[PDB]
Enzyme design. Structure first.
Site, mmCIF file in Angstrom:
data_model
loop_
_atom_site.group_PDB
_atom_site.id
_atom_site.type_symbol
_atom_site.label_atom_id
_atom_site.label_comp_id
_atom_site.label_asym_id
_atom_site.label_seq_id
_atom_site.Cartn_x
_atom_site.Cartn_y
_atom_site.Cartn_z
ATOM 1 C CB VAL A 201 1.946 2.813 -4.275
ATOM 2 C CG1 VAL A 201 1.068 1.572 -4.355
ATOM 3 C CG2 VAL A 201 1.305 3.990 -5.000
ATOM 4 C CB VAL A 202 1.107 0.384 0.951
ATOM 5 C CG1 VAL A 202 1.139 -0.952 1.675
ATOM 6 C CG2 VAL A 202 1.983 1.405 1.658
ATOM 7 C CG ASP B 109 2.761 9.143 12.383
ATOM 8 O OD1 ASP B 109 1.884 9.870 12.895
ATOM 9 O OD2 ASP B 109 2.816 8.906 11.157
ATOM 10 N N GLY C 29 0.282 7.868 -0.813
ATOM 11 C CA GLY C 29 0.391 9.145 -0.139
ATOM 12 C C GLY C 29 1.784 9.291 0.436
HETATM 13 O O1 LIG Z 1 -2.785 -1.502 5.934
HETATM 14 C C1 LIG Z 1 -2.650 -2.669 6.082
HETATM 15 N N1 LIG Z 1 -3.824 -3.546 6.098
HETATM 16 C C2 LIG Z 1 -5.164 -2.955 5.923
HETATM 17 C C3 LIG Z 1 -5.685 -3.222 4.482
HETATM 18 C C4 LIG Z 1 -7.157 -2.756 4.295
HETATM 19 C C5 LIG Z 1 -7.657 -1.844 5.448
HETATM 20 N N2 LIG Z 1 -7.893 -0.599 5.131
HETATM 21 C C6 LIG Z 1 -7.835 -0.382 3.768
HETATM 22 C C7 LIG Z 1 -7.598 1.066 3.334
HETATM 23 N N3 LIG Z 1 -6.482 1.660 4.032
HETATM 24 C C8 LIG Z 1 -5.872 2.882 3.464
HETATM 25 C C9 LIG Z 1 -6.678 3.753 2.752
HETATM 26 C C10 LIG Z 1 -6.139 4.913 2.201
HETATM 27 C C11 LIG Z 1 -4.789 5.196 2.369
HETATM 28 C C12 LIG Z 1 -3.980 4.328 3.081
HETATM 29 CL CL1 LIG Z 1 -2.242 4.705 3.289
HETATM 30 C C13 LIG Z 1 -4.518 3.163 3.633
HETATM 31 CL CL2 LIG Z 1 -3.466 2.049 4.549
HETATM 32 C C14 LIG Z 1 -6.891 1.633 5.424
HETATM 33 C C15 LIG Z 1 -7.083 0.194 5.914
HETATM 34 N N4 LIG Z 1 -1.295 -3.254 6.256
HETATM 35 C C16 LIG Z 1 -1.010 -4.646 6.442
HETATM 36 O O2 LIG Z 1 -1.811 -5.508 6.484
HETATM 37 N N5 LIG Z 1 0.419 -4.801 6.571
HETATM 38 C C17 LIG Z 1 1.029 -3.456 6.458
HETATM 39 C C18 LIG Z 1 2.370 -3.031 6.510
HETATM 40 C C19 LIG Z 1 2.676 -1.669 6.372
HETATM 41 C C20 LIG Z 1 1.647 -0.730 6.182
HETATM 42 C C21 LIG Z 1 1.961 0.631 6.044
HETATM 43 C C22 LIG Z 1 0.998 1.521 5.605
HETATM 44 C C23 LIG Z 1 1.366 2.853 5.490
HETATM 45 C C24 LIG Z 1 2.660 3.230 5.812
HETATM 46 N N6 LIG Z 1 3.552 2.349 6.229
HETATM 47 C C25 LIG Z 1 3.240 1.074 6.351
HETATM 48 C C26 LIG Z 1 0.305 -1.153 6.129
HETATM 49 C C27 LIG Z 1 -0.003 -2.516 6.267
#
Ligand code: A1IXL
Ligand code: A1IXL
Lengths: 361, 357
Positions: free
Chosen positions: B44-45, B156, B40
């Site tokens: 992509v992460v 944010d 998004g």
């Molecule tokens: O998200 C993390 N762990 C949770 C993994 C699973 C937990 N759920 C899984 C699903 N998820 C999800 C679903 C849909 C869309 C999006 Cl976008 C997401 Cl996230 C929500 C959480 N991160 C982590 O461990 N180190 C990191 C370093 C940076 C960032 C980051 C993310 C966005 C922007 N800038 C930095 C994120 C993490």
């Protein structure tokens, strides 16, 4: 004052004395029953009611009346009269228990379905609304926008939730004018109106000198959503929506930036070329529909089509075919019965707006 | 990047990446098991397993503007905090033709977020225990006090950006794509910060805001954890203000001038101040209600600094020497403050650091 009572079958009936929404102030004795709440939020509670005599269903918008100024929505609702706008039948004041506060009740037409609820049923089943219905709903919204813009009134909140639909007659009525306001040149206006997804770029940039063209952008965001099955410019933050706008429209030039918010909020964007509009939509998406979206979703607010120019677009040529019908057999709703108030933005546009068959004696 | 495999059919990527912290010394790192864990907007992460320590890492792959260097990368390299996700390495790569260069941010992996946990207790119609509300809010305030000491505003703060290790109860702030150094005089954009958590001066469209917008967004998270749902919801800016007037009451004309001095020329209905204690559940702790009243204030200057929030009486149970986690473990690092952290108010060390530290 209102008088609560019952019928002779035990059904409960409320009787008020209200003023007609249009015409001379000749108060009326209105009696309604079967009062169900049909959603609230912010402004107040919106009820549904059944009239005792005609049996018609109506909606009642109950908001708190500021004892300072008169309610702005009431004054705009009483000036309007268009087939594609929800009608204000009556309006009366009342209270609750104590509170010592005055409530304003808005008796309006009930319409069973909304554009937001129709577009979801199709989206949830992995399908799209038939284009004939996309043409009809967009045209009727563009007709209502041209009517309120002829009075300088901007809706400032065009979203699929605010577009009501009768599924039998395919009649669309624009509703919710709690964010509407007459826009006078030179006067500033708040930059936090309009729901997300459908906010114009000049609204995201916090401009206060915007015109009625913000409704055109929101209308284009509705047409693109009905074609894509999902919002075209989604995002939780204003940064998130602007990224999706550049993803399609491209990076705005320094001239386009100046035309939106001349303040230049001082932000540097990533440079991305113009996504070919055809690649945004489905394969069998009509080319004229793709052309209309690009003419409505422009950075430069003055470059967007006016609501009257949008109605005369080639995308609505089928609605002007003399043999056009609804899929269920009935005729189309009133599409060419404009008024001189309606053409006032461009009277020469009537040659395209009223087609050869509608001028038959 | 040199793509390869192992000898069991697993596929392994090997790049040459520069460590985020310390000196620039590109390393030969290798990772496997790459899955997409969300995208998004920015890109992509991914998630992957380092081929040596088996440690899970998150790789943020955004597109690099060949003009200026990425603001998020330059901010990542300056930060080093226990309540902030760590940029372990970063490297550049492409993807087919494009002629476009991407930037990959190798960050720590944390399995859960505050959003996934808070959305869940609410689904079961139960509230998060106050002990976890205290642990999560305090670590967020400690992270904001750190980044505000460098003048950096996150811009944010939302539960989706608050990562959670459920075993250690560790909270880590992430996502700095909206972060920026706020210097007095220079204006800033007013369309940052996500809905539900935007500051009032942001909705009014002010460009002269401070780092206190992060404190407001923090207060919107605390009130959400006590209620089980957003305290200031709404699809529009008008709808969010209404939900604010219902609680905080009608702002005085002096409060409007301190938020957006432009005065966006609007008249609001006059509603009395909803007593803060009647907003939450009956058994809601009073110190939690008092802390919310000092975070969700109209005038930005009257909001507690992130350090003054850590010293609040609501976090007193965290400083008890017998406090423990519900699962039996000890509370994570909460008192290893640095001089950089306490620079906003050094005399707060008497309260922030308990005797048994
Ligand atoms: O998200 C993390 N762990 C949770 C993994 C699973 C937990 N759920 C899984 C699903 N998820 C999800 C679903 C849909 C869309 C999006 Cl976008 C997401 Cl996230 C929500 C959480 N991160 C982590 O461990 N180190 C990191 C370093 C940076 C960032 C980051 C993310 C966005 C922007 N800038 C930095 C994120 C993490
Ligand atoms: O909605 C109607 N019919 C749908 C049947 C009920 C199911 N709906 C589902 C959708 N929902 C809704 C949608 C958006 C916002 C909000 Cl707050 C709500 Cl509650 C309404 C109920 N209306 C109708 O027939 N005449 C009307 C006159 C005015 C208004 C109106 C709408 C918004 C604000 N202010 C007045 C609405 C109607």
């Amino acid at each position: 004052s209102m008088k609560v009572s019952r019928d002779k079958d035990g059904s409960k009936v409320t009787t008020v004395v209200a003023t007609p929404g249009q015409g001379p102030d000749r108060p009326q004795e209105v009696s309604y029953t079967d009062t169900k709440v049909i959603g609230n939020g912010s402004f107040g509670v919106v009820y549904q009611a059944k009239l005792c005599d005609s049996g018609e269903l109506v909606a009642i918008k109950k908001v708190l009346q500021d004892k300072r100024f008169k309610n702005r929505e009431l004054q705009i609702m009483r000036k309007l009269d268009h087939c594609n706008i929800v009608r204000l039948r009556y309006f009366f004041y009342s209270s609750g228990e104590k509170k010592d506060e005055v409530y304003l009740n808005l008796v309006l037409d009930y319409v069973p379905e909304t554009v937001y609820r129709v577009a979801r049923h199709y989206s949830r089943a992995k399908q799209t609304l038939p284009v004939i219905y996309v043409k009809l709903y967009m045209y009727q919204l563009f007709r209502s926008l041209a009517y309120i813009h002829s009075f300088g009134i901007c809706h400032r909140d065009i979203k699929p939730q605010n577009l009501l639909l009768d599924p039998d007659t395919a009649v669309l009525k624009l509703c919710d004018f709690g964010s509407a306001k007459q826009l006078v040149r030179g006067e500033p206006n708040v930059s936090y109106i309009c729901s997300r997804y459908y906010r114009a770029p000049e609204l995201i940039f916090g401009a206060t000198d915007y015109t009625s063209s913000i409704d055109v952008w929101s209308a284009g965001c509705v047409l693109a959503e009905l074609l894509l099955g999902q919002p075209i410019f989604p995002g939780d933050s204003g940064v998130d929506q602007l990224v999706e706008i550049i993803k399609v429209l491209g990076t705005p030039t320094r001239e386009q930036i100046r035309e939106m918010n001349p303040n230049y909020t001082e932000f540097k964007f990533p440079q991305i070329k113009a996504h070919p509009w055809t690649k945004v939509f489905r394969p069998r998406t009509p080319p004229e529909a793709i052309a209309l979206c690009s003419r409505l979703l422009e950075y430069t607010p003055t470059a967007r089509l006016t609501p009257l120019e949008a109605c005369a677009h080639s995308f609505f040529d089928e609605l002007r075919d003399p043999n056009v019908k609804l899929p269920n057999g009935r005729d189309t709703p009133a599409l060419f019965n404009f008024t001189t108030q309606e053409l006032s933005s461009n009277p020469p546009l009537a040659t395209i707006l009223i087609p050869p068959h509608a001028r038959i004696q």
